[PDB]
Each structure stands twice: as C-alpha cells, then as structure tokens.
Amino acid sequence: AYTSHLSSKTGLHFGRLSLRSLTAYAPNLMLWGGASMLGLFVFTEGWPKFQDTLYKKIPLLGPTLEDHTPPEDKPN
C-alpha cells in the first residue's frame, strides 16, 4: 500500500568522521601502516641493532650484511 512516513536512522558520527567512512578507509589504513613500516625498515638498514634484531633473518639476504673480516685487521 501507500507509504505516508519515511522511517530512518541517523547513524554514528562525530563531525566529519563517520563509522561508514572509516570502515571504507580501514583496509587501506592497514595498508598505509604496512607501507610506513616498510619505509622505516628502509630507513634503519645501516643501523646495527635492527640489523641484528630483524634484518638478518631473511633467508637469501641473511649473510649479506654481516662482516667476514678476521679480528686481526681491526684495531678495536
């Protein structure tokens, strides 16, 4: 039959940000998080602590960052 009203909801928001928009943006927020952690994994690669902590567990590029000099050619 006929529709006299328009039944509705008003959603969830705090201004510009709605939960619909952040659910639309959330997989790419995770992708941007992965991209920025890749960026700092680039920017800390000549850093010794993170080299021994994470960047020498890679299977093919494992011994590509270590040193193969004997301890007779270093002064300290």
Binding site: T69, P71, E72, D73, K74, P75, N76
Partner: protein, 50 residues
C-alpha cells in the same frame, strides 16, 4: 698507530711497533713524571722534540 691495522700490518704487528716507543704517561702518585710503552691510540712520534 691504529690506522695501520688492516691496511698494511696486522694488529700484533702494529702493537709491537708501537710498544717499541715511549710516550708521556700520567704522573704517578707522588707527582713525578712517568713514561709509557705506546699503544694503538697514540700517534707516530717524530724524531725531534721541537
């Protein structure tokens, strides 16, 4: 002396050439001047004092 290690000589080869010289040590507990065998931190000494 430490800059020669791994360029032209071995670590002990530089340690012996440095220890064949004598540098000014920190003065002893009575305040008298002391001398010292060289180490890898020191510099290659000239032949003249001034």
């Amino acid at each position: 002396w430490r800059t020669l290690v791994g360029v032209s000589h071995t670590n002990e080869e530089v340690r012996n050439m440095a220890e064949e010289f004598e540098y000014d040590d920190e003065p002893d507990e009575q305040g008298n001047p002391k001398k010292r065998p060289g180490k890898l931190s020191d510099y290659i000494p000239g032949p003249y004092p001034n």
